[PDB]
Design a protein around this nucleic acid. Structure first.
Lengths: 117, 109, 54, 103, 142
RNA sequence: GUGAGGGGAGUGAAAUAGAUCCUGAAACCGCAUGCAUACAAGCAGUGGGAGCACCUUCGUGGUGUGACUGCGUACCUUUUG
RNA sequence: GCUAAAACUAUGUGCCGAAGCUGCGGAUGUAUACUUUGUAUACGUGGUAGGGGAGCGUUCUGUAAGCCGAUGAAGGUGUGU
């Protein structure tokens, strides 16, 4: 019962190459080089799915800080004031408000400094 | 409605022939013929023969006028190679490859 | 001495970037009207209103 | 007007007529869900910032359906150690359409 | 996608003029870098340039503390062997204060194409006059 | 060039079934179309992300391209590493 | 780059900061309870040498004188799922 490998092997190599398309030089043409490229891409994706949350939190904090300093407070003091006032709006929403609506962010800053004092 | 001519099996490297091919690509037939006639390259003779055959095909089989004909397309492809052996010093042997090419030219109004 | 790595097709093409050919200087000779190479006798032996052969 | 709502451990800013995706909810397709824990409601110059929650605010929405997101591939590999692992993933979601906002 | 990034086309750059008489170099440079990068706007995006144009006048009056005026050394190497050249703060401020400010700010700015583009928005002049009246800069105290 | 090689006509169900002639994969090498690219330093990807071209149920859409930006020194074997 | 510091000693308030902890959704091993069922509960789910368990796919024999097929099989090349 002799078995030929051609069809299955070709299908596997073709699938790897198809996943590899868009890379430079031998990475998108040669199976040996392409197979390594796919695995490293997967590893980078696994690490970046975690890094993304940190990066977006840092961006939100920066925008909130800019808005707070326009309204006369630092980011840390505004966060403390909001916590004292018992406001539970998160930083993503606070940053969106800071970017798109200055009056509402000013009202929030007023509330925070009122709680501070 | 391009008219095509193919010269298969010319005994010259495609790298060498493609220089003349690029030199004449996209120009009018009369100017291209003058260039080929006054060039000194070996590939020029073969390209000229292919172009003349294409113009004859367009005139005879398609009832077209040469005055409005330009070199609409042209390209060279590699053909089958011949393998030879070159003796070297101290009994060492090397493999010689003799290359051939196919020339395709299309003329259209 | 020999390469440690095989060169890329892109680098090979970049090296060949200076390989393009050029046209010669062709003009029409007034005596016969046939296209000829500038400053050269025509294929029929005509130049500057003189015929070399018979 | 716009409002801020909580759902699935995250917060969203919404307006009437908007469509959004949230974590898989148990509500049946075509049903209506009401949020009564609004944190903030803005209407022009009228700004209500509920400390825990604005009293009387209500956001009503309809459940269009449920679905799954695009596939993600997980890969783990330890070089020179002869170890490898893979798995796929598709996160469920419920799609909502905001139909009413009341302060 | 509820979080959005600033669009370069929609960005607006405002012009300001700053006087350097009597101020401390580093503490001024920090604020200049902040404004050049655009950290002071709620639309700040790391991959976009949202800063403002900053003109500096009376740059040769900038001050340092301690003995740094004599003991602070600026180096530069020509790639020839033994080609290390040295100068100090007083001579360099006398000759090319623009270089002083350029070094101070480029040190505090990011390193890349965006950093190079951002540093172009700073204009430094040794005198009390600047050629940018057409842009109508406003006085900024920093 | 009474060459080779082609184009038309004709045969055939089929002529990229035309005689190193069933199907005709990959490496490698051409032509054409769209986007990017000549002030910027590194395993070439990954997470974000403006602009452009085409298709559009014009949509919070689809297909190509990817200015700018955070992170990031291949695989196997053998080893304390 | 920094000098009543952006250095050192002592002290207070706040904040940033990990794949640690919490929140939302999903998968799975063991043991209990519901004393049928597969539903809840509790704990657990980094890993080399190595041990245990469960599957995908390929050639051929029976089921097969059956079923699909020139209204197009295998094979090749794209798309969607």
């Amino acid at each position: 019962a002799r078995v030929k490998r051609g069809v299955v092997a070709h299908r596997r190599h073709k699938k790897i190459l198809a996943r590899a398309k868009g890379y430079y030089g031998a990475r998108s043409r040669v199976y040996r080089v392409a197979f390594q490229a796919v695995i490293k891409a997967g590893q980078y994706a696994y690490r970046d799915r975690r890094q993304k949350k940190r990066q977006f939190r840092a961006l939100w904090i920066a925008r909130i800080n800019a808005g707070a300093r326009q309204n006369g407070l630092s980011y840390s003091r505004m966060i403390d004031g909001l916590k004292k006032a018992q406001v539970i709006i998160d930083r993503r929403v606070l940053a969106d408000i800071a970017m798109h609506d200055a009056v509402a962010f000013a009202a929030l800053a007023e509330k925070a400094k009122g709680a501070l004092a | 409605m391009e008219v095509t001519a193919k010269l298969r099996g010319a005994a010259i490297s495609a790298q060498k022939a493609r220089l003349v091919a690029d030199l004449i690509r996209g120009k009018s037939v009369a100017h291209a013929l003058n260039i080929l006639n006054f060039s000194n390259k070996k590939a020029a003779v073969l390209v000229k023969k292919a172009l003349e055959s294409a113009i004859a095909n367009a005139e005879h089989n398609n009832s077209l006028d040469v005055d409005d004909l330009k070199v609409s397309t042209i390209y060279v492809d590699e053909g089958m190679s011949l393998k030879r052996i070159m003796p070297r010093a101290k009994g060492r042997a090397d493999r010689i490859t003799k290359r051939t090419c196919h020339i395709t030219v299309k003329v259209g109004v | 001495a020999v390469q440690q790595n095989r060169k890329s097709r892109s680098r090979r093409d970049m090296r060949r970037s200076h390989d393009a050919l050029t046209e010669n200087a062709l003009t029409v000779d007034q005596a016969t009207g046939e296209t000829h190479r500038r400053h050269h006798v025509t294929k029929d032996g005509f130049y500057r209103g003189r015929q070399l052969f018979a | 007007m716009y409002a801020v709502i909580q759902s699935g451990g995250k917060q969203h800013r919404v307006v009437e007529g908007e469509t959004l995706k949230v974590e898989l909810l148990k509500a049946e397709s075509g049903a209506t869900i009401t949020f009564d824990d609004v944190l903030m409601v803005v209407n022009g110059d009228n700004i209500q910032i509920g400390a825990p929650v604005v009293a009387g605010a209500k956001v009503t929405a309809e459940v269009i359906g449920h679905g799954r997101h695009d596939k993600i591939r997980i890969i783990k590999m330890r070089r020179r150690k002869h170890y490898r692992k893979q798995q796929g993933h598709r996160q469920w979601f419920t799609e909502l359409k905001i139909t009413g906002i009341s302060g | 996608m509820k979080t959005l990034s600033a669009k370069p086309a929609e960005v607006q750059h405002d012009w300001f003029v700053v006087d350097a008489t009597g101020k401390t170099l580093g503490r001024l440079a920090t604020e200049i870098a902040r404004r050049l990068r655009g950290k002071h706007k709620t639309s700040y995006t790391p991959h976009v340039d949202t800063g403002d144009y900053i003109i500096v006048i009376n740059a040769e009056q900038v001050q340092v503390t301690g003995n740094k005026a004599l003991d602070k050394k600026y180096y530069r190497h020509t790639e020839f062997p033994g080609g290390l050249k040295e100068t100090n703060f007083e001579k360099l401020v006398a000759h090319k204060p623009e270089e002083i400010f350029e070094r101070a700010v480029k040190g505090m700015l990011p390193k890349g194409p965006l950093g190079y583009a951002m540093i172009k928005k700073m204009k430094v002049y040794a005198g009390s006059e600047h050629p940018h009246a057409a842009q109508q800069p406003q006085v900024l105290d920093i």
